[PDB]
Amino acid sequence: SVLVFEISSKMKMIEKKLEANTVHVLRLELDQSFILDLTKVAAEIVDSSKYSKEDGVILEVTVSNGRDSFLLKLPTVYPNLKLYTDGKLLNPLVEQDFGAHRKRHRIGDPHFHQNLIVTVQSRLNADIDYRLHVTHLDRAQYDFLKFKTGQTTKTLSNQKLTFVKPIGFFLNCSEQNISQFHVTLYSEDDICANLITVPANESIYDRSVISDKTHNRRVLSFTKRADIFFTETEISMFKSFRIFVFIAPDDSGCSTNTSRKSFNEKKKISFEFKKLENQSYAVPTALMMIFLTTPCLLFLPIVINIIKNSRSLHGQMLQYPVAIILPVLMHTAIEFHKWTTSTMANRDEMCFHNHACARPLGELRAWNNIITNIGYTLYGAIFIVLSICRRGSHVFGTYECTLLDVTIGVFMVLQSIASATYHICPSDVAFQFDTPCIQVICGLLMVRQWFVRHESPSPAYTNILLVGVVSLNFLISAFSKTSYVRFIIAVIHVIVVGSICLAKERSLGSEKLKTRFFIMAFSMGNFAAIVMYLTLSAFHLNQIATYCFIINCIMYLMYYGCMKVLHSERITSKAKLCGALSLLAWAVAGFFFFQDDTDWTRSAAASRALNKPCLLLGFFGSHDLWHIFGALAGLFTFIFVSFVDDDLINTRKTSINIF
Amino acid sequence: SVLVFEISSKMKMIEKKLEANTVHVLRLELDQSFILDLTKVAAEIVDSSKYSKEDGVILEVTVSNGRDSFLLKLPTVYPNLKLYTDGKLLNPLVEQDFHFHQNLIVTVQSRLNADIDYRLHVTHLDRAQYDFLKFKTGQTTKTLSNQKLTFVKPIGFFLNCSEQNISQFHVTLYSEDDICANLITVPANESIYDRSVISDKTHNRRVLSFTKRADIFFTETEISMFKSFRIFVFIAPDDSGCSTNTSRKSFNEKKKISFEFKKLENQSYAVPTALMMIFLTTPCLLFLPIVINIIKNSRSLHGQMLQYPVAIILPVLMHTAIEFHKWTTSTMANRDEMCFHNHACARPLGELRAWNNIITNIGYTLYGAIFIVLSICRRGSHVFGTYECTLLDVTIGVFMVLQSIASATYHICPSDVAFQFDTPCIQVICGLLMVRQWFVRHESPSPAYTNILLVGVVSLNFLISAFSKTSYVRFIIAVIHVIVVGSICLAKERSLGSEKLKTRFFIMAFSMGNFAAIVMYLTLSAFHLNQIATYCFIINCIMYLMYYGCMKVLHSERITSKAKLCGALSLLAWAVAGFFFFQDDTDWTRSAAASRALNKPCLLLGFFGSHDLWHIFGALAGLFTFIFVSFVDDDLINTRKTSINIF
RNA sequence: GGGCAAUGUGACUGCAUCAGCAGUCACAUUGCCCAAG
RNA sequence: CUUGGGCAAUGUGACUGCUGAUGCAGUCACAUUGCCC
Ligand SMILES: [Zn+2]
Ligand SMILES: [Zn+2]
């Protein structure tokens, strides 16, 4: 037999000893004062231990206030533990939901007032003691996202919170004239939590029909930061969004060492509700494009005048390996597919950007991290032209590095494609493909300088070079969770450097003039490197392949130069300038790349907790300066290796120092 | 002010009226006469059209009986329509729960300031279409015939495998009516409607929108993780996710459903597997007296191990590196909803839902390791005979070994991923056999011609898929097709001398061949989208070998008897090995549901299906059309490289 | 293994100083056509 | 032109209530001492 119990509009701690087979129905008269009042309820079970033998559902609270409802099927179950208390929210009433009026405070024609029905239950034949804990967030906090005229960012401060006391919000855009929205949730204390947004129509606790695919509800873990972004199209699709911030007891999905106060520790939180407006970065891009075209002055005094001094093809067109495109194009196709055919919230849930200052442009959330890759595809289409513009004669100078330079061009372009397709959704997918084209190019430069004084280098070496780089990258990715991955990299690195030493020795005859020093140099440098990335927790798994590859490239090129100067040939002054500039550009590219600070060895929240702010214009971060100066360094190294052996074009192909 | 209302067991259709700002709770005292009675409590809104102006929700019915509670926020809306009636189920009480009695609260609120009328049906299901999955001793199959399933009466099920001592379970639903439906199952302790934090990240509940068929496979690592399962089969209102149009969408119609509960036990198919390997080593009777005899009669490496293109592997070992990562990290219940096999012949093994479409992809990696050796061990005369095609036939080797990797993972489970990669490799093999027989009389054909052929196929394979959903894709496979075959015609006359007795009688074929194929697939919707690029290819190969098989004898050269019989079987294989491929019928255009309705029963031994055999016979034709082009000109072995014709 | 009293923490309800927010009643201005004198 | 009434919003203060911050006291939980039959 039910026992209705009127509740007071003022009391928030309702301790009632529920009898056996009795079903309380509390009741709270809602009036003009509860419009847009987030009503959060919270149950409990007193002396929880006494029921530790009975399993499943014990108590059942079913709050409801006419516009929404939910159930609390105590005691909740979790991947770790069972809790005997938990709170949920309610879609608050609105001004419409108990009628519009003029004056007189419900004059007397109608007498309308909603009501909040709190039900209780028990599956036990025995008696239970609960503690309902109804509270309220008034209109001052829910539906706080109304903006005044000439305002863009409203901000809370230290909004307290607790496992049994979450916070919501109500972003309505159509009724607010909003284009783009970007939330931000600071915090200080490492206590796991959950941000959750849902369009207004739609409800959180209710499961969907084939949900995991039909799911417009993002759910973001976070400890010290989380960010949202309501794109223009999502706004025009749903028109009104409910933000929530739940919070969890433990740190399972967040970390390993767990907080002590189980489901009891309050955690601070702030917010930032920005109201952006669409903007195309024409000024920030300006300084870039001009800065990526000042070094092109290195063609006017040299090459554009040589082409003026001159003013099978089917066979090479068919023998040039163009299945070297397929890795990067396949990965960019897969990535674009998985991006476009994803829900509008699975993007913000899955793409771990640097939402610190990842500047957006329409649908894309990090424009700078993308369009700064145009340095490459600008310094990529150059090489593919210079070579095919000055390919000749065949009796003086060294052999022609025509097709190898065309391949360095095709890969300087594929680098931009891979980078701008991985900086759309930087998730931990099986294949990284940000650096691997940089690695392939820093291999091709080595092969060019290895073969330039023997024969025309064939591009078919890019086949094994690419297979090596791609297999190594997939390997690093797939073994990232264990501990011996840096040992795998150490041993493969050793095998490669040893094979290179051997190929060196079996090409000349073990001359003490060159090999005795060269082998030693390589082995000591690369063993220093193996140490530096096998004992130090500052080389992540992403960067070790790139560092070893660019170090091999730099070392072999400096050795080429050292042997050219020891044999007493001339290195033109422009070549020395180009070499020094390539060295310092690679140095800058390093100093910037080293702060990638991205390792999928940690959980989601630990990766959203990182926020490295940008440096220039509020548009250039650190990874983007890497993207630029990598292209600069590639261009400078390429121009170097295309200039140092120019002064020998007046020497026969017989008296050339072979090495 | 609340209003209690007791209702005994005699009222099923409770009709009441709801005043302004009022709240009705009800109660139907339950006793031991209600245990294991799966109940459903639905609500409506009388005079529905009167409320068509109010936006949002009207009633909030919250049934609850202690053990199982849920909600009803009428009118539940759907992307096509708003239903003013909905019903849900209840986990019945357990015998342990039994002076003493359990009850059934039904709160009914109302946000509307005006009055509301409503009804309240209550229904029951037990003793059948529930608790029916109890197996007798030594019983592995239980069956139900023409079970009614109306929208007002969803069917329930309870599988308690722990007590039933089950290891692997299978569930099938044959039907006949073209009515949408839904099939959801959950772990015992879980509910159906209740979400939680990262619930989607633990969404162990499956949903198989099924028109005519649906299948449920309960693995060993599911049973051993939840130990008890709940099954339901609803009737979805609209045909959006399960069909195309609002054709007869307005209805609440009955539906007949069957079942077949098969309690499989894990095993290995030593009978049919071995009956295949011996089938793929008998047509190897050709290598008996010839290839291993020349070696006995016969009894740079540092550079060509570099100048060989090994970057042609990556288009596959990158793709399969993803179809795996997507198979492992996919939740244990997501695999039954994302992977659309052909469960009429998809015999399982260990974990995989299909081991008849994977272990028959060993006819390739077996016929692959032969071409890799019988070409390397068949070159040792370097001024006699045709040029040694012993580097190319390493690729045709590899691309017969790759094909047994891109395919035997596309048959792990075939999502509608961007790249199909079941045929692509076979397409290229039938390509190389052209480049080989082309350059066979001019120069040792460098394998680097794949670099331009691969990017050809993969692009034409990605181009197909991206525009698979649109209506004008088949016209794109006309312009891309015509362009290349036009060149391959033009590329001939610019090499031979435009001899009309040869060229004008060779362009006449590809003009008549490819065109006759275009209209065959451009006007007729029998060649599905994926199968056209392949049949385009294998024809270019066969024609270019009917030609090379003629231009040899047309120039009055003799062919050896072994090549006579070899090639004559290749035509027999490529003819039958098409007929089986001709029944794939996997068009990712149609809806998810109908893509499950396909069911082609096993052909032989209950382990060989139609699309299965295209994986075997695609290896015979892949072999006979290789031995052919390496034995066709053996008679010319005693003729100098100058006294030979050229074409 | 048990309870009591303290030590320190972590929650919790209601008093006291400040914040945004809702409602209540009264104030003041404004123009307004139709109606008439 | 003035009054009577109606509209509407601006902003005016008056009162009530909510939510978050610093202290104030007091209830509940966890670990160390002392005691006990
Ligand atoms: Zn990048
Ligand atoms: Zn297949």
Short mmCIF file of N, CA and C in Angstrom, two decimals, chain B residues 172-264:
data_model
loop_
_atom_site.label_atom_id
_atom_site.label_comp_id
_atom_site.label_asym_id
_atom_site.label_seq_id
_atom_site.Cartn_x
_atom_site.Cartn_y
_atom_site.Cartn_z
N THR B 172 18.95 -18.17 -35.11
CA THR B 172 18.57 -17.77 -36.45
C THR B 172 17.10 -17.42 -36.48
N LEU B 173 16.73 -16.46 -37.33
CA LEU B 173 15.34 -16.03 -37.46
C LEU B 173 14.93 -16.00 -38.93
N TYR B 174 14.42 -17.12 -39.43
CA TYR B 174 13.76 -17.09 -40.71
C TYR B 174 12.40 -16.44 -40.55
N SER B 175 11.98 -15.70 -41.57
CA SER B 175 10.65 -15.11 -41.60
C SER B 175 10.19 -15.08 -43.04
N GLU B 176 9.04 -14.49 -43.28
CA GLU B 176 8.60 -14.30 -44.65
C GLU B 176 8.17 -12.88 -44.96
N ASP B 177 7.53 -12.21 -44.01
CA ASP B 177 6.94 -10.91 -44.29
C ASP B 177 8.01 -9.84 -44.46
N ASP B 178 7.77 -8.92 -45.39
CA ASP B 178 8.69 -7.81 -45.61
C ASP B 178 8.41 -6.69 -44.62
N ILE B 179 8.34 -7.03 -43.35
CA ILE B 179 8.08 -6.07 -42.29
C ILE B 179 9.37 -5.81 -41.55
N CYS B 180 9.66 -4.55 -41.26
CA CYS B 180 10.82 -4.24 -40.46
C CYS B 180 10.71 -4.91 -39.10
N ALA B 181 11.81 -4.92 -38.37
CA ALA B 181 11.84 -5.53 -37.05
C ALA B 181 13.10 -5.07 -36.35
N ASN B 182 13.40 -5.69 -35.21
CA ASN B 182 14.63 -5.42 -34.48
C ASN B 182 14.88 -6.59 -33.56
N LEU B 183 16.15 -6.84 -33.29
CA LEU B 183 16.57 -7.96 -32.45
C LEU B 183 17.65 -7.44 -31.53
N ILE B 184 17.36 -7.36 -30.24
CA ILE B 184 18.32 -6.87 -29.27
C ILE B 184 18.55 -7.93 -28.21
N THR B 185 19.79 -8.04 -27.76
CA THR B 185 20.15 -8.94 -26.69
C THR B 185 21.10 -8.23 -25.75
N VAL B 186 21.08 -8.64 -24.49
CA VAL B 186 21.87 -7.97 -23.46
C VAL B 186 22.38 -8.99 -22.47
N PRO B 187 23.50 -8.69 -21.82
CA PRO B 187 23.90 -9.50 -20.68
C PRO B 187 22.81 -9.47 -19.63
N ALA B 188 22.76 -10.53 -18.82
CA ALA B 188 21.68 -10.66 -17.85
C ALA B 188 21.58 -9.43 -16.96
N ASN B 189 22.65 -9.11 -16.24
CA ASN B 189 22.59 -8.03 -15.26
C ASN B 189 22.28 -6.69 -15.90
N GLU B 190 22.47 -6.55 -17.21
CA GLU B 190 22.21 -5.28 -17.85
C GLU B 190 20.73 -5.16 -18.21
N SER B 191 20.28 -3.92 -18.31
CA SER B 191 18.95 -3.58 -18.78
C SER B 191 19.01 -3.27 -20.27
N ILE B 192 17.93 -2.74 -20.81
CA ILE B 192 17.87 -2.37 -22.21
C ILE B 192 17.98 -0.87 -22.42
N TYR B 193 17.29 -0.09 -21.59
CA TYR B 193 17.14 1.34 -21.83
C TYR B 193 18.09 2.20 -21.02
N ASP B 194 18.72 1.66 -19.98
CA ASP B 194 19.46 2.47 -19.02
C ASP B 194 20.87 2.74 -19.52
N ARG B 195 21.16 4.01 -19.79
CA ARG B 195 22.52 4.42 -20.13
C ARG B 195 23.31 4.69 -18.86
N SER B 196 24.61 4.93 -19.04
CA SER B 196 25.50 5.32 -17.95
C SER B 196 26.75 5.97 -18.54
N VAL B 197 27.68 6.33 -17.67
CA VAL B 197 28.92 6.96 -18.11
C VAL B 197 29.68 6.03 -19.05
N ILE B 198 30.02 6.55 -20.23
CA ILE B 198 30.72 5.78 -21.27
C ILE B 198 30.00 4.47 -21.57
N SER B 199 28.67 4.50 -21.48
CA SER B 199 27.87 3.31 -21.78
C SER B 199 28.12 2.84 -23.20
N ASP B 200 28.12 3.77 -24.16
CA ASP B 200 28.46 3.40 -25.53
C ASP B 200 29.83 2.76 -25.61
N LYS B 201 30.75 3.17 -24.74
CA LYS B 201 32.05 2.52 -24.67
C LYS B 201 31.98 1.14 -24.03
N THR B 202 30.80 0.72 -23.59
CA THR B 202 30.56 -0.64 -23.13
C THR B 202 29.27 -1.18 -23.71
N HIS B 203 28.91 -0.74 -24.91
CA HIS B 203 27.61 -1.05 -25.49
C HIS B 203 27.59 -2.51 -25.91
N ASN B 204 27.38 -3.38 -24.93
CA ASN B 204 27.33 -4.82 -25.16
C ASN B 204 25.98 -5.28 -25.66
N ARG B 205 25.13 -4.37 -26.11
CA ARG B 205 23.81 -4.69 -26.61
C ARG B 205 23.78 -4.54 -28.12
N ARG B 206 23.31 -5.55 -28.81
CA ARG B 206 23.30 -5.54 -30.26
C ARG B 206 21.90 -5.27 -30.79
N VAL B 207 21.85 -4.74 -32.01
CA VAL B 207 20.58 -4.41 -32.66
C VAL B 207 20.70 -4.78 -34.13
N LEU B 208 19.91 -5.74 -34.59
CA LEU B 208 20.04 -6.27 -35.94
C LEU B 208 18.74 -6.02 -36.69
N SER B 209 18.61 -4.84 -37.28
CA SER B 209 17.40 -4.52 -38.01
C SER B 209 17.22 -5.55 -39.11
N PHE B 210 16.23 -6.41 -39.00
CA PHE B 210 16.11 -7.53 -39.90
C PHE B 210 14.75 -7.56 -40.56
N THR B 211 14.74 -7.60 -41.89
CA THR B 211 13.50 -7.78 -42.62
C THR B 211 13.14 -9.26 -42.72
N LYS B 212 14.02 -10.05 -43.32
CA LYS B 212 13.72 -11.46 -43.56
C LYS B 212 14.62 -12.42 -42.80
N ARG B 213 15.79 -11.99 -42.36
CA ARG B 213 16.67 -12.89 -41.64
C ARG B 213 17.59 -12.09 -40.74
N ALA B 214 18.04 -12.73 -39.67
CA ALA B 214 19.03 -12.17 -38.77
C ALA B 214 19.65 -13.31 -38.00
N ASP B 215 20.89 -13.13 -37.58
CA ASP B 215 21.60 -14.22 -36.96
C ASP B 215 22.42 -13.72 -35.78
N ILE B 216 22.45 -14.53 -34.74
CA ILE B 216 23.11 -14.21 -33.49
C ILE B 216 24.08 -15.33 -33.17
N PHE B 217 25.34 -14.98 -32.95
CA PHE B 217 26.37 -15.95 -32.65
C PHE B 217 26.93 -15.63 -31.27
N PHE B 218 26.77 -16.56 -30.34
CA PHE B 218 27.25 -16.37 -28.97
C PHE B 218 28.56 -17.13 -28.81
N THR B 219 29.66 -16.39 -28.76
CA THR B 219 30.99 -16.97 -28.79
C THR B 219 31.35 -17.60 -27.45
N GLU B 220 32.52 -18.21 -27.41
CA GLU B 220 33.02 -18.75 -26.15
C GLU B 220 33.43 -17.64 -25.21
N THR B 221 33.92 -16.52 -25.74
CA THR B 221 34.34 -15.42 -24.89
C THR B 221 33.21 -14.47 -24.55
N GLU B 222 32.00 -14.73 -25.02
CA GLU B 222 30.82 -14.02 -24.53
C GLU B 222 30.19 -14.78 -23.37
N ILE B 223 29.80 -16.03 -23.63
CA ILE B 223 29.23 -16.89 -22.60
C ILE B 223 30.10 -16.86 -21.36
N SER B 224 31.39 -17.01 -21.54
CA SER B 224 32.29 -16.99 -20.40
C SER B 224 32.53 -15.61 -19.87
N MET B 225 31.79 -14.59 -20.29
CA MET B 225 31.91 -13.27 -19.68
C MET B 225 30.62 -12.75 -19.08
N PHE B 226 29.47 -13.31 -19.45
CA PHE B 226 28.19 -12.86 -18.90
C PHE B 226 27.29 -13.98 -18.43
N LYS B 227 27.45 -15.20 -18.93
CA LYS B 227 26.90 -16.40 -18.32
C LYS B 227 25.38 -16.47 -18.37
N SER B 228 24.72 -15.43 -18.86
CA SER B 228 23.26 -15.44 -18.97
C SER B 228 22.80 -14.31 -19.86
N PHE B 229 21.92 -14.61 -20.81
CA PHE B 229 21.59 -13.67 -21.86
C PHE B 229 20.09 -13.49 -21.98
N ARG B 230 19.69 -12.30 -22.39
CA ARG B 230 18.30 -11.95 -22.64
C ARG B 230 18.15 -11.61 -24.11
N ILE B 231 17.10 -12.13 -24.74
CA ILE B 231 16.84 -11.92 -26.15
C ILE B 231 15.44 -11.36 -26.31
N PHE B 232 15.29 -10.37 -27.18
CA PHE B 232 13.99 -9.81 -27.52
C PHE B 232 13.96 -9.54 -29.01
N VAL B 233 12.76 -9.51 -29.58
CA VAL B 233 12.58 -9.24 -31.00
C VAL B 233 11.40 -8.29 -31.14
N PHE B 234 11.69 -7.02 -31.39
CA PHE B 234 10.65 -6.00 -31.43
C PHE B 234 10.01 -5.90 -32.80
N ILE B 235 9.26 -4.83 -33.02
CA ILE B 235 8.81 -4.44 -34.34
C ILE B 235 8.98 -2.94 -34.47
N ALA B 236 10.03 -2.51 -35.16
CA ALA B 236 10.27 -1.09 -35.30
C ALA B 236 9.13 -0.44 -36.08
N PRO B 237 8.76 0.78 -35.74
CA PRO B 237 7.62 1.42 -36.41
C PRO B 237 7.90 1.77 -37.86
N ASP B 238 9.00 2.45 -38.13
CA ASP B 238 9.30 2.96 -39.46
C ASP B 238 10.37 2.12 -40.13
N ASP B 239 10.46 2.27 -41.45
CA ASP B 239 11.38 1.49 -42.27
C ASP B 239 12.61 2.30 -42.69
N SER B 240 13.12 3.16 -41.80
CA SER B 240 14.23 4.02 -42.18
C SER B 240 15.56 3.26 -42.18
N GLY B 241 15.96 2.75 -41.02
CA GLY B 241 17.21 2.02 -40.96
C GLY B 241 17.15 0.62 -41.54
N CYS B 242 15.96 0.12 -41.82
CA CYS B 242 15.78 -1.25 -42.27
C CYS B 242 15.18 -1.36 -43.67
N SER B 243 14.90 -0.24 -44.33
CA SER B 243 14.38 -0.25 -45.69
C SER B 243 14.62 1.13 -46.29
N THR B 244 14.01 1.38 -47.44
CA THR B 244 14.31 2.58 -48.21
C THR B 244 13.24 3.67 -48.10
N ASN B 245 11.97 3.32 -48.27
CA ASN B 245 10.93 4.32 -48.49
C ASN B 245 9.84 4.21 -47.43
N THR B 246 9.01 5.25 -47.39
CA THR B 246 7.79 5.22 -46.60
C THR B 246 6.68 4.54 -47.40
N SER B 247 6.97 3.35 -47.94
CA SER B 247 5.99 2.57 -48.67
C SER B 247 5.33 1.61 -47.69
N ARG B 248 4.04 1.82 -47.43
CA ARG B 248 3.31 1.08 -46.40
C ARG B 248 3.98 1.25 -45.04
N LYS B 249 4.43 2.48 -44.75
CA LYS B 249 5.03 2.77 -43.46
C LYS B 249 3.98 3.00 -42.38
N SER B 250 2.78 3.43 -42.77
CA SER B 250 1.70 3.67 -41.82
C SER B 250 0.96 2.35 -41.58
N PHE B 251 1.21 1.74 -40.42
CA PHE B 251 0.63 0.44 -40.09
C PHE B 251 1.04 0.07 -38.67
N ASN B 252 0.31 -0.89 -38.11
CA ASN B 252 0.76 -1.68 -36.97
C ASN B 252 0.30 -3.10 -37.28
N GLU B 253 1.13 -3.86 -37.98
CA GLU B 253 0.71 -5.11 -38.58
C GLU B 253 1.37 -6.30 -37.90
N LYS B 254 0.68 -7.43 -37.93
CA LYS B 254 1.22 -8.66 -37.39
C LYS B 254 2.42 -9.12 -38.22
N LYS B 255 3.11 -10.14 -37.71
CA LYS B 255 4.29 -10.65 -38.37
C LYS B 255 4.57 -12.05 -37.85
N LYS B 256 4.90 -12.96 -38.75
CA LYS B 256 5.25 -14.32 -38.39
C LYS B 256 6.76 -14.45 -38.33
N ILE B 257 7.25 -15.15 -37.30
CA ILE B 257 8.68 -15.32 -37.07
C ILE B 257 8.94 -16.76 -36.67
N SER B 258 10.07 -17.29 -37.12
CA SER B 258 10.54 -18.60 -36.74
C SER B 258 11.82 -18.45 -35.93
N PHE B 259 12.39 -19.58 -35.53
CA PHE B 259 13.65 -19.58 -34.79
C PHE B 259 14.36 -20.89 -35.02
N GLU B 260 15.67 -20.89 -34.76
CA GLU B 260 16.46 -22.13 -34.70
C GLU B 260 17.60 -21.89 -33.72
N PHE B 261 17.47 -22.45 -32.52
CA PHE B 261 18.48 -22.31 -31.49
C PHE B 261 19.43 -23.50 -31.59
N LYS B 262 20.61 -23.28 -32.16
CA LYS B 262 21.60 -24.33 -32.32
C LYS B 262 22.69 -24.16 -31.27
N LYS B 263 22.85 -25.17 -30.43
CA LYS B 263 23.88 -25.17 -29.39
C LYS B 263 25.15 -25.82 -29.94
N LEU B 264 25.84 -25.06 -30.79
CA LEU B 264 27.07 -25.54 -31.40
C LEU B 264 28.09 -25.93 -30.35
#
